[PDB]
Symmetry: C6
Subunit: 211 residues, 6 copies
């Protein structure tokens, strides 16, 4: 990544073994549960496009998903090239060239070029741009791998209200990577109590009532 | 977070894999036991609002609680906007804008803006303000998930006094996120001894007597 | 805590996840065995009162003990206020105020104030003062939770001398958070041998003889 | 490796125990699955040829593969010597000599020489050149140890489509260290559905249809 | 400990959680096997007397040994006071006092005083002096806890020579915290072979012969 | 070890707990498999002779081997003294003395002297010289503890070729701390195939053929 040193200047630092291992392990343990995306964003803080590719490429499983991600990336890269065309021909000697989509995605750009863009004044934040494309792709994957419709999250006859609401908001989070449906999907006993509370009741108030 | 470098100046640093993992694991292991809140406060030392959202969003379980937390945050954010209205219109070129509630909560503000506010002179400590709102919300959750009333913590016939008092003060801590009720809830044998000690007896003295 | 940077100046640093976890784990694994106190002192090197409260508050179990500790702290804080009264009224604009007992204990003081006192010239070492009060309290807890009187540590007929002396000095350490009683509590066979050695014999010499 | 210090200058740093252990463990856990190569590239960021040899030589198993790797390295080294012949005879006193293939591979060059080349202006990036040769060799090994032809990846009668596509793209990755064959190798039920979708369908769309 | 910072100056640093845990764990895992002493010396690199006491005091078991160690320390401290008497009376205002035995052992000296002595010019290396006393004491403990005389290390009829020699030199190391006795204690078959080799044979040569 | 600080100057640093533990664990897990030597070399990067002795002395097992190592070291030290005799008598006040063999091996030299030699201009690299002697000794130990002759590595009737070649090159590595013998030791079926390939066939080509 690119970080500020002790002196106060933006320099490249090697991606740490701790960062590499943390990402690989989150994917192994959590697959594409929604919370994997904020972990990715945090572990890739200050990442160059090279670092972002490293993180994605170190994943061994889920290769269908990783192929789907590459498709989203290529779509975003094509849209970048449409909005920001780069003049062809020979570059001015010793001057910074403009990044194409594939340069932002780290496939046709060198690390030195990536560092040049990211530390320029004004900076072309190719790492942040690429990360946005990756997260767009990861959001689609999270939605794809969401196992259950929110319509099928219903409280069991003996299921505690707290456990039901946890499943409900867990599913909501996965499905769109509400209080009315929550009441509708509650069990008969709890539903009667929730209907008595009236409109505008907070989740906190609903929990206390069915507890 | 924002930290002082070796030279002695406030700069942004990436949230560490160690910090990220520590928070995720405390929540997995302890849920919303009261001691999770001081751990949160310590792990989020110097946090920007972005860092605070990262920590909250990396939590995979307890999504009902996380939804309740967002409600508390929005309430605090609305109260901020009532007390500190921001003038609408175009901002002065190259000048620092005033933070709204949603800027403090990191939903409508960029990292650069957050850094600007937190390192300004005088600083607008948006991280500390947001953390206060989050902890208010976490305290409510701790109280909500407290399993037992202090009224139902009573010493068993064969339960050692030390074990009973541990349950008692554990419950007290959870319920409000005393010595009289402690005596009242003690078993017959211990109660007789504690009544003999008289008023103004310390917990230390009570323990020695029923030991 | 407060540490010296690379340049050579006292600055605040965030308490580390490693430090937080180490303390929590020692308490989980060792409870209030005597060796927990030197570990606490070492893990809290350079701690501010805020850091010390963090460490104490992150402990989830042993809440009776933690309540007893707060009592000892309040007693020490009251004694501080008796010896060092602070003049009431409005403070001089932009000047350092004098710490009361509750400021030293971190309940009525801010981190900024704590840093100000600890890095002042001359420094008011509020962290070291508070740590002394905490350790006084922890020593009482260690003595309280000591399971056995030294009078009841006696060598078994078949117990190796080395194992007996380990229990003996372990108990001595817990009870007051000697050679004569050691001999008196030895088994008949070993006692006869130890009596033959005469007075002024070192522990080393006693071990060799009953080995 | 060679890194930029706090002051902003390229200096040698010892390879870390964390890096050494991470590499050894990835090889133990993953053998030569394709994702081992990006992990190698990331763990060897800024590596000198000495560091690269250390990483390769610390591997205890897979010695057939390691011998095959040495062969690829020697081939690349010979091609380097053909393209870049070095003038024989005595070197100019106190001057930098030109690297031969075996110098780039770290077998006939000292660490000091490697540092000299890598930090020269312009730099001769012997670490990056060597790493390219190593990765060429590792790619061959990955292909060699690929257990299955893509022709033999076929969807089972009861195998979920998601599981089949994961095996498919996993095998594709190993074999060349597509959508048509994916459809051809699908089971009868899924194949009928995929044929109905028509040409130009994305993987995402195919998954939704057979889900 | 006292370390050199980045700028190049001797300053105090807090003992690390990693160091504290490493020492505690070595003692738990290895007790007083001979190799524990070089680990102690290495983990206490640059230690102040306070750090050395921390390390010793964090040990929970082996309290007989720890009491024996204190005796050795007090003996060394008394010998220091005999060789280096300190003038009594009031110290010169703002001047460095001379360390007594108990100051070197960290019982009557403050950290500030210890730092003053260790960073003085010329330095009074109180940490190194104390560590020498501690290691003298640890050596005695290692010898004390050595379970077997070298006279009782004899090769079994079916014991491989390599296994026998490992036990032999392991015991030698513990007992004094040779080739002739090694041959004498070998089994009949190996002994005959070793006698044929003649005098001046290396251990390497003896191993090859009985292998 | 001796490292370059942030400012860019050679200074002593304490050996890390991570380094100490890594070495101890590699020896426990791998004994004297050949790959232990490059791990030793890497873990001892920049080591002083004191550090090298620490690493060797922290090993608890394999004391026969450690005694054999000391013999190799003493032989190398004697050869050093023969090639580089040091003038006897009193040293020039405040001047650097010349290292003898035992000074290079860290038995008669202080850390300060070792640092002086290693950071001198020109430097006397006593750490690198000693490490060379240690590795010479470790190579002998690796060869000694090699369990099998390469003559006894033969492919089983049902053993996959890949597994056989792994054993073969593993043994080759241990025995000398080839393609013809590989073919000769292959099983009848594979041998026939390998004989058909003809001379000059690479290992890669042989693997493909018997796969």
């Amino acid at each position: 990544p690119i970080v500020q040193n002790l002196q106060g200047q933006m320099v490249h630092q090697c991606i740490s073994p701790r960062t590499l291992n943390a990402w690989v392990k989150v994917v192994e343990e959590k697959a594409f549960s929604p919370e994997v995306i904020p972990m990715f964003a945090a572990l890739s803080c200050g990442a160059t496009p090279q670092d972002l590719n490293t993180m994605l490429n170190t994943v061994g499983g889920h290769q269908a998903a990783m192929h789907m991600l590459k498709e989203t990336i290529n779509e975003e890269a094509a849209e970048w090239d449409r909005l920001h065309p780069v003049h062809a021909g020979p570059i001015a000697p010793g001057q910074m060239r403009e990044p194409r989509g594939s340069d932002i995605a780290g496939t046709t750009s060198t690390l030195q070029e990536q560092i040049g863009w990211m530390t320029h004044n004004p900076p072309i934040p190719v790492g942040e741009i690429y990360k946005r494309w990756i997260i767009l792709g990861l959001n689609k994957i999270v939605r794809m791998y969401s196992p259950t419709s929110i319509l099928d999250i219903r409280q069991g006859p003996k299921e505690p209200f707290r456990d039901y609401i946890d499943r409900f908001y867990k599913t909501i989070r996965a499905e769109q990577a509400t209080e009315t449906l929550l009441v509708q999907n509650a069990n008969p006993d709890c539903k009667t109590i929730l209907k008595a509370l009236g409109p505008g009741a907070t989740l906190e108030e609903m929990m206390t009532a069915c507890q």
